[PDB]
Amino acid sequence: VLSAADKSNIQAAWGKVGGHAADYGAEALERMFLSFPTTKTYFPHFDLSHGSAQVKGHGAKVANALTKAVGHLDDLPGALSELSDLHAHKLRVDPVNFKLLSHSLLVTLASHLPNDFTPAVHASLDKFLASVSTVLTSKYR
């Protein structure tokens, strides 16, 4: 449902991110956990302290998935098939927690891309993350 205008804003932003993707994903996770303590209950098997190997590694996994998504903006339901099952059916992740991570991600991107994070680019990235969130919350019981 995303516009061509949004897609090219998203593609350009993530292209700038480049090989920083995994580092920024780990950052976004830390900002989520510290800003929103409720989200920590999803990761009790994790050491959640700063610079932990598990948050680092999980940050890389999340960023990888967003790279995959950025490349399939015409078909997110199709491309995030296994992740939708994981998040909706198996893990039963509360949809508000997607808004929380989404916000964390935007904070991280703004922090690192201050020149390229225009109002227009901000709005397109918010729509992209809301669109991914919808797919990940689409296949519950």
Binding site: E30, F36, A110, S111, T118, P119, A120, H122
Partner: protein, 145 residues
Amino acid sequence: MLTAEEKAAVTAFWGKVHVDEVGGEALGRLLVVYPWTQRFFESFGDLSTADAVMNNPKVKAHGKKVLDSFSNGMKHLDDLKGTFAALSELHCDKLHVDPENFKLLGNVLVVVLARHFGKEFTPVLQADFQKVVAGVANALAHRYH
């Protein structure tokens, strides 16, 4: 509900902030990213394009007044309810702004501060400011409760 540690860190951070530069950006991004918010700002003139909104003189002056209310809030973190009493009356009783948008503007402000302050806006410090924005959004919504 901040700790004494979080209160001191976030109040120290706020003092450094050039509000004039931050306020107008925050409210501009609000009007651009969440366009329905424009409903409450028709007296402000040209809001047609992103550059119109970001460069609108009234948007800039209003944003500064918004941040000034955060600056007051910063001095009364344990009485945000009383501090924002009249502003809650305005936003709820007169304007009927849905309280979800109080969170949205606070969140937009956080994004703007990150854009400006980069790695200095640390995960801890941003977390501290999120509790401030959560607290302020609740106090503004009080007339609804």
